[PDB]
């Protein structure tokens, strides 16, 4: 399939303090590779994957400037929005930006992205076309037409289809070993009797990459979206992920429930039964 690059920017205005805390994180697919923290003593774009510091100092130097500058703006923007919403300075407000690009299996350009959100709520975002903006509320409209004035539509597209994609390509080849891996989930099933008539069949899947995974319980071959419980995928801390799906079972019917596992790495889907 495809590949993806995403940067996540969050700025939270600290009341009484002039500069807010800024956190920028860079991922490829599901592997983080750069981090920048305002409260970090580095004040420099740090590497966080093994394959990124083969890029020379000219890269780290410009990459730091790039999001020192992105941080500067959020500082200025946090104040601009404080005015758009009639909000006092003693509050704490968050600006969250995420932009990135998607390449296909042949390095092709597929999709661009840029979304902005103020206090966990949608603010402004770039449509699929990359030519249109859509403003969530009133305030975002006074920003929307401001960006439409400067052709922000175009110039986002020239980052997304230019250096963004050329970066994602160069990363997928420099860290060709790490990034093109796939790791089939290491599976196992669990039996916890709860009552004298029911138990719980839990369906585990440890150690897999990428994080895309599909767990589904089935009674007699019929989909079971009812007594099913599914925790969101957890990171194991070593670049691999885990996810388990449990179901409540009437005693003596475990041989009727079937757990089915779908992953990108696996050639064919798994099935687990007691």
């Amino acid at each position: 399939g495809s590949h993806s690059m995403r940067y996540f920017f969050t700025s939270v205005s600290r009341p009484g303090r002039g500069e807010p805390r800024f956190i920028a994180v860079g991922y490829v697919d599901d592997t983080q590779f750069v981090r920048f923290d305002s409260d970090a003593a580095s004040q420099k774009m740090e590497p966080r994957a093994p394959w990124i510091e083969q890029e020379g100092p000219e890269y780290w130097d410009q990459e730091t400037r790039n999001m020192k500058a992105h941080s500067q703006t959020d500082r200025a923007n946090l104040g601009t929005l404080r005015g758009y919403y009639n909000q006092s300075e003693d509050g704490s407000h968050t600006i969250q930006i995420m932009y990135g690009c998607d390449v296909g299996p042949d390095g092709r350009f597929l999709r661009g992205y840029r979304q902005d959100a103020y206090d966990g709520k949608d603010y402004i975002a770039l449509n699929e076309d990359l030519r249109s903006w859509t403003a969530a509320d009133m305030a975002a409209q006074i920003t929307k037409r401001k960006w439409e004035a400067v052709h922000a539509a175009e110039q986002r597209r020239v980052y997304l289809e230019g250096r963004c994609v050329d970066g994602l390509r160069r990363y997928l080849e420099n860290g060709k070993e790490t990034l093109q891996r796939t790791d089939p989930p290491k599976t196992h099933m669990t039996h916890h009797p709860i009552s004298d008539h029911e138990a719980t069949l839990r369906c585990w899947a440890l150690g897999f990459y990428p994080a895309e995974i599909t767990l589904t319980w089935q009674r007699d071959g019929e989909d079971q979206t009812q007594d099913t419980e599914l925790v969101e995928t957890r990171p194991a801390g070593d670049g691999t992920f885990q996810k388990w799906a449990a179901v409540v079972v009437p005693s003596g019917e475990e041989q009727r429930y079937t757990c089915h596992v779908q992953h990108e790495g696996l050639p064919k889907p798994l099935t687990l039964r007691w």
Epitope: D106, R108, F109, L130, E154, R157, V158, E161, G162, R163
Partner: antibody
């Protein structure tokens, strides 16, 4: 994987008309601008004409304005260059290239990738 | 619409080559660079002043400031022998403007 294939060139005679075509593969051709850039053998590159994603307008260099007309067929993924009243000056190789950025209303950003091109040579 | 390149640049193998693309306020235009080896098509090696495409090695770097864009090739290999053209877009001309081209020779 993006591929451009020029054709239709060859040896022509002055005054005549000639039609170049560029067959495209490896991208939603309906979304990008396309360009023609020619090169007289032993000389530099020269921009000819270019056309936006839909064919709305038609950008012309002045040295070939009025005589050339560039078009595209999005249903065929093909870029065309029509040459009318061929002259000895049009003797050159004609490259076809795809504007990198999408939905550009005018041919302002860099052209990548370039096809191997076709050769147009006119003489008596 | 006037952008001028030197006609040829000769450099010793392993040295650092430097090709200029001068123009009136060319620093305020977006300059690109294409490398064309004999008989083949031009290849984008530097776009928007300094960006390198995926396949281009880091030896090749771009630059553009004031009135002169500059293509720099560090640690010249023999395979760097080709013609090099810069690319701008003249807003006030409706013309994409190529440079004259520079024939880089790495002498043996």
């Amino acid at each position: 994987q993006v591929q451009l294939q020029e054709s239709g060139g060859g040896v022509v005679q002055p005054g005549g008309s000639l039609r170049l075509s560029c067959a495209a593969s490896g991208f939603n051709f309906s979304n990008y601008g396309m360009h023609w850039v020619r090169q007289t053998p032993g000389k530099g590159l020269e921009w000819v004409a270019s056309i936006p994603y839909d064919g709305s307008h038609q950008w012309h260099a002045d040295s070939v304005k009025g005589r050339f007309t560039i078009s595209r067929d999005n249903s065929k993924n093909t870029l065309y260059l029509q040459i009318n009243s061929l002259r000895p000056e049009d003797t050159a190789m004609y490259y076809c290239s795809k504007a990198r950025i999408s939905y550009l209303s005018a041919p302002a950003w860099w052209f990548d990738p370039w096809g191997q091109g076709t050769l147009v040579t006119v003489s008596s | 619409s006037v952008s001028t390149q030197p006609p040829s640049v000769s450099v010793a193998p392993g040295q650092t080559a430097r090709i200029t693309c001068g123009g009136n306020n060319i620093g305020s235009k977006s300059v690109h660079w294409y490398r064309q080896k004999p008989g083949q098509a031009p290849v984008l090696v530097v776009y928007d002043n300094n960006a390198r495409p995926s396949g281009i090695p880091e030896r090749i770097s771009g630059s553009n400031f004031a009135n002169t864009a500059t293509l720099t090739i560090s640690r010249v290999e023999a395979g760097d022998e080709a013609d090099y053209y810069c690319h701008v877009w003249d807003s006030s001309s409706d013309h994409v403007v190529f440079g004259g081209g520079t024939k880089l020779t790495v002498l043996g």
